[PDB]
Design a protein around this ligand. Structure first.
Ligand SMILES: *[C@@H]1O[C@H](CO)[C@@H](O)[C@H](O)[C@H]1NC(C)=O
Ligand SMILES: *[C@@H]1O[C@H](CO)[C@@H](O)[C@H](O)[C@H]1NC(C)=O
Ligand SMILES: [Ca+2]
Lengths: 10, 269
């Protein structure tokens, strides 16, 4: 299955 | 930012440099016919306590650069050229469209990258890349615990030193991976002015002004960095600028490099 790296902030 | 690695490790990292978020450029890893790519993210600090947020996302794949910049809604840069959306690049093998208020890049080989022109970034890889990538996002091997590792594969002492190992190439004199309490800031719009001539330009190695003779004896970067921040913080004030320049002259003189008449050549008389 596909996998996801994410980020947000700060 | 707050990060969430491919393998699900949650961590914070407030570096303000340009970082390798995900790449196939991984020493000691076989590529098996996988298409190579690199996603980088340039961060930007604010406030004190110092935190950082992403300001540029760059996707390098199939001989094409697509960067997506904060607040440039509806637009990307294809090889540095500002471009409306939607757009098809790399022989129709990569596409970027606007959806639900974000830029959505998709590639034929399966790389998905989105950025909302604010500070949310997502990178999605097909299952085939398991264990075949590296960078701030880790190696996507279903193990969240081996993701904080140098490019050469060994564990890193601290988060900020780990992040530093993953800086992307390119001069970035004002950036840092961690702010040790007492750290100036400066808005990115005022940066080009304060780094150029009339301001801290003479303390940068190519700009060819009255201080070039000393550059090879007293490496200027630390003085340059201090000039831009001391000046940027002081609203561009001339006397802060002149003091910072005079301190480089003092270091130069101690190194045996005399700089006479400099004040007249930078307007600090
Ligand atoms: C993409 O960016 C890299 C790094 O700046 C550069 O070496 C390369 O030539 C660029 N590619 C294109 C097609 O502009
Ligand atoms: C990997 O690099 C770090 C510094 O970036 C170094 O301390 C470490 O010894 C290196 N590991 C190997 C196996 O060379
Ligand atoms: Ca892992």
């Amino acid at each position: 299955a596909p996998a996801t790296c994410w980020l947000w902030g700060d | 930012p707050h990060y969430h690695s491919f393998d699900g490790r949650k961590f914070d990292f407030q570096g303000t440099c340009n970082y390798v978020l995900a790449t196939t450029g991984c020493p000691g890893v076989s590529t098996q016919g996988l298409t190579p790519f690199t996603v980088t993210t340039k961060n930007q600090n604010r406030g004190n306590p110092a935190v950082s947020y992403v300001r540029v996302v760059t996707v390098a794949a199939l001989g094409t650069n697509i960067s997506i910049h904060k607040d440039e809604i509806g637009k990307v840069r294809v090889n540095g050229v500002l471009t409306a959306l939607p757009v098809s690049v790399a022989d129709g093998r990569i596409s970027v469209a606007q959806g639900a208020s974000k830029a959505l890049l998709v590639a034929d080989f399966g790389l998905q990258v989105s950025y909302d022109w604010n500070w949310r970034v997502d990178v999605t890889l097909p299952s085939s890349y398991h264990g075949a990538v590296c960078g701030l996002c880790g190696n996507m091997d279903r193990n969240p615990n081996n993701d904080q590792v140098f490019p050469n594969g060994t564990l890193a002492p601290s988060i900020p030193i780990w992040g530093g190992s993953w800086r992307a190439p390119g001069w970035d004199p004002l950036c840092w991976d961690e702010c040790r309490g007492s750290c100036p800031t400066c808005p990115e719009d005022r940066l080009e002015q304060y780094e150029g001539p009339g301001f801290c330009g003479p303390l940068a190695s190519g700009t060819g002004g009255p201080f070039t003779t000393c550059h090879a004896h007293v490496p200027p970067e630390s003085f340059f960095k201090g000039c831009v921040l001391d000046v940027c913080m002081g609203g561009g004030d001339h006397d802060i600028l002149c003091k910072t320049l005079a301190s480089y002259v003092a270091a130069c003189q101690a190194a045996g490099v005399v700089i006479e008449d400099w004040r007249a050549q930078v307007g600090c008389e």
